[PDB]
Symmetry: C3
Subunit: 461 residues, 3 copies
């Protein structure tokens, strides 16, 4: 009796799970919104802005109308390598976003110390890929909250808390090729493994060297650390980068997981759209919404507020097929990256509509309990869209100078709706609906062009 | 000198052969129609109505517009496992159809006894997959006729005879998890292998246990039985589930095999249509044609009649791009499952046309020599369409309550053209073209709604 | 720590490299045009006209509208096998074209003798595939020039010189199953390896037998010959048919290589078009341009002329989306195979436009320095288009009686623009714009139909 080999199982549920972390795939939590949960872990934030800064290079005429295709190929080639390192070291890639990848090693409290060693080694081996288009790494550790929000058809998640705030602060201190540890990470780590130095005006530290004790053996140590890693591929599945590659059809699980993935990605997954259709340089309008809270580390306070904001945003976006591309925590606040124009969702008057939707969002969110400040940046132009990452772990992402610009406008012009010159000029709304703003030098931004506040239709706000 | 490994050979002829049994793939018979041939074998009929009854579940709004995709994924996951068992035990899957899969082990007469043992073991291991959405299994053995019918562009086949009648009768007696043997199967089997019980008012038996003799070794026995299995993958190809996976380009063979496969499937096979385009919940009209004969086990009588009917049906269907999805033998008669509306073949007025085509078919077939009764059921609504089965052995199939309803209408209202309320109401043909029928309780049917006879345009028929 | 296996790397750059020889893939030469380089090597020309003559068979109604699909499947099945032999013997397939495949083993001068032995063995093993739709093989050796020409967006290459002239002359002497050596090949070869015979009225020879010395071991000999083969897959990559399968993303390399590949192929490569869309029987107009030179073995003379001609041709073709499918050296001259109508590039009035473009090309090229004669053949009808060859090495190709006819018209009616009857009749240009020509018997052509000169719009040329 023959024994044929199992076939490569490429079911829709597997393909959906490539777009999600294990935190969600194996999360099994209530469908109630908001949902909050609490754990401990180590975070790694890998600043890949040096790669995504290539969007400019690839809009050159030199690329003969295949800039987007070339961009996605070269980005994925480098980002894949980072993803593989994270996964082989036992990490969960949470999100690709804010010109960064964020990864998590969730463990019980007692194991944070040893897991920090693992993550430092991983970090150093990531830097190792690119010796000779480099990255900066921040590490944090400690208490982490998770929030899941959404409605009956769509779900989003966020991780929150001081360790999350810390990991971005750490990464912002890093220079290229650095690994920076948060103060708490440094307090919790195995100091015998590493040589550090002080970072001026900061309690964060820089790892100069991982130099373990004489009798240390990393592979044996790692094996010990895998006892605490629930989903590390093992046994018959030790050849797989993710256990999620083994997922079998389960309609109730797939119904829950598809809520995290945009409809046009699901169309591709279902082989009802060409696999290359979403890689494009396309004109869009970015509406970047920032919500600041009194206290942004307290999920129990900020979770209902985000949920209420989300319900309104989604209703407003529905009317114009705008989409939410990403939600993430910034140093200050919860940010929604909304896009008007992307998977063939491109209505005419996208600009006047974008500004009107921004104002609606601004007015509603400003009256939500516990939301202290709302800030919205609106920028329009060519952006790269595509599925970025590894075959086994990837996400649809939008990258470009106008993305960056809308993000910086919402941070440098807080409490108002701002727009760029493309949007202002294109809108053909009357000019007294705007205010011309002072020029600010914004980290990452070369020549803003004139920026404007969208004051709105009436003098008396 | 290097020796690179043969590549995965995924030629069009291989892809076409996935849709056909070995009976046809390796049949090499004349292109003359009808064609009849005669052999012996063991049949297994696996009632998968418990899986296909899930079409209802998947039309819920809960499935957010991906019901068809979810349905095909979960069906294929379970049906694949059944198919693999059949193939590894040396069976030929003949058809997926009538909420069942039918499989054949063709052998010389002297080996029927030992092959029945093989098939009983297979049957028990199929039940084993689903312990903890179960199936019922009928087995028959004996003389089997095959009929191939069609024209210059299209071919269809049927297996016929008492063993075929028996295998459906056996399966209809089974409860869930049962294996029922036909009277002849029980007469021909190795009684020392099994413990049976009587089935009330029947000469069929139920297998309680396969309990072989003390010195029996199934793997050694199976190896002996493979001497008689012409196409069992072996040697260099012992890792393949089907020898047909090894087929090489051969234009004369491909011309013959493509005649069995619908044009829209061939479009997919030729990579000229997306691989997911045929998985859909779509509105159609089912026209289910049953032809009863004096004697339905005699291919030499019924073969010309079916051929003549087929020639007329196809001409009538051509005019409205209706398609024949399946042809199969029922307890009573040869049934044609015709569909109006499926691979983007959807003409307007599908309902008046469907009724007019049914009447045409009814009038012509009623005058065909040896056709004793014609019965036609017409039902319209949402049905699941898709390629169902294993990668290596699968078929386009239509599944749904309206399929079931049209099938039961043709059996419970013999000798007439009947239609459901959707069809009657939608047609906007005058009401005196119909007769409102008595309500019958039909096994498998919950609330028919009012049913109608299509009497036709004139009072005097 | 797990070690997952590298995935099958199917990047766009790899897929582009399948369409090109190693000569270009690893060429790294200046982007300046024309570019010329000089080397030595052995050439093999494999006449596959016996396969491509099947286009006629596959336009039969017997193939039910899948002639093109069946043709490409059967062609690729046989041509793949030839390609694998060439590659495993260390050859570089340069082009698929002129009903032939051309391959090159580039080596330093001192190794030509031993490499000829390798190529003769390869040739004999190619014939071996088809014992029991056969091929003819010519071999040449010696000095070879390469020319690369084009503009900022498109590139083409040619190999030139007496060895190239020789390899076609050798192949034209061959009968089926023959291997014919050019005079220089025979002068340079290891005469102890082979038994030859004279070819009447020729200094070329026919290989009767490869009968090496008593102590000869081909595998050991081949291993020695691989020292001189720069890109022979080896070591960790000894399982690959081409090193080019290992190419990694590199935007500057991909920008250079995509210039050799038509835009519609790049669309497929980018998964923005179905993989089967370019296999078709379609009506087109072939415009076959031949340019003859005083001295066609001297790249330094003919290279600027070809470049100047190319610049004009491309400008003329642009206006009507005509494409250049192939450029190659014929016994006499440089030929451009231009096509009007192929990857959905089909403008109305294709015929009057084709004739007007031919005349433009004829008038311009006739005034180019060093171009001695221009001849253009114009023929219109159904042709097979598709990607032909092996997965790892293949090219878009057009095949058909009208291709053949336009090629023979340009050779048998030199110095003029000629067209077939389909073109003349269809154009609805006045009849005095043409001259009806004497009938010539053209090798390969059965019934021309009447042929015409396109004299043009005025009496006085
Ligand atoms: O989920 S992280 O963007 O706050
Ligand atoms: O071929 S079986 O449906 O009678
Ligand atoms: O490149 S060969 O056609 O002269």
């Amino acid at each position: 009796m023959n024994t044929p080999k199992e076939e490569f199982q490429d079911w829709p549920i597997v393909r959906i799970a490539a777009h999600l972390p294990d935190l969600i795939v194996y999360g099994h939590f209530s469908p109630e919104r908001p949902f909050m949960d609490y754990f401990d872990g180590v975070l790694m934030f890998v600043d890949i802005s040096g790669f995504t800064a290539m969007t400019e290079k690839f809009s050159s005429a030199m690329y003969m109308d295949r800039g987007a295709e070339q961009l996605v190929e070269i980005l994925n080639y480098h980002i894949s390598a980072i993803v593989e390192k994270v996964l082989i070291f036992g990490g969960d890639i949470l999100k690709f976003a804010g010109d960064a990848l964020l990864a998590l090693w969730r463990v019980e409290r007692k194991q944070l110390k040893n897991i920090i060693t693992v993550v430092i080694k991983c970090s150093l081996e990531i830097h190792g890929l690119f010796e000779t288009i480099r990255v900066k790494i921040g590490l944090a550790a400690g208490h982490i909250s998770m929030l899941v929000f959404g409605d009956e058809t769509h779900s989003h998640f966020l991780v929150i808390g001081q360790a999350v705030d810390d990991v971005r602060l750490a990464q912002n201190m890093a220079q290229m090729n650095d690994v920076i540890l948060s103060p708490n990470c440094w307090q919790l780590c195995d100091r015998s493994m590493i040589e550090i130095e002080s970072v001026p005006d900061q309690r964060a530290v820089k790892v100069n060297f991982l130099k373990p004790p004489p009798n240390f053996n990393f592979d044996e140590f790692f094996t010990k650390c895998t006892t605490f890693m629930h989903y590390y591929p093992s046994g018959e599945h030790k050849n797989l980068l993710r256990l999620a590659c083994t997922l079998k059809p389960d309609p109730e699980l797939e119904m829950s997981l598809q809520k995290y993935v945009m409809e046009s990605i699901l169309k591709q997954i279902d082989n009802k759209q060409l696999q290359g259709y979403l890689s494009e340089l396309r004109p869009v309008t970015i509406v970047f919404v920032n919500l600041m809270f009194e206290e942004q580390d307290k999920a129990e306070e900020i979770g209902p507020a985000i949920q209420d904001a989300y319900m309104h945003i989604t209703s407003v976006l529905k009317i114009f097929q705008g989409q939410i591309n990403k939600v993430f925590m910034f140093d200050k606040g919860c940010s929604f990256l909304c896009v008007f124009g992307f998977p063939g969702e491109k209505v005419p008057d996208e600009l006047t509509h974008a500004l009107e939707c921004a104002m609606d969002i601004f007015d509603f969110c400003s009256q939500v309990h516990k939301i202290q400040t709302v800030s919205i940046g609106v920028a329009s132009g060519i952006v790269f869209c595509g599925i970025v990452g590894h075959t086994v772990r990837h996400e649809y992402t939008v990258i470009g100078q106008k993305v960056n610009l809308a993000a910086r406008m919402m941070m440098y012009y807080p409490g108002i709706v701002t727009c760029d010159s493309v949007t202002y000029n294109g809108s053909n709304l009357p000019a007294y609906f705007f205010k011309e703003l002072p020029k600010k030098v914004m980290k990452g931004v070369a020549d803003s062009g004139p920026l404007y506040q969208y004051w709105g239709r009436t003098e008396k706000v």
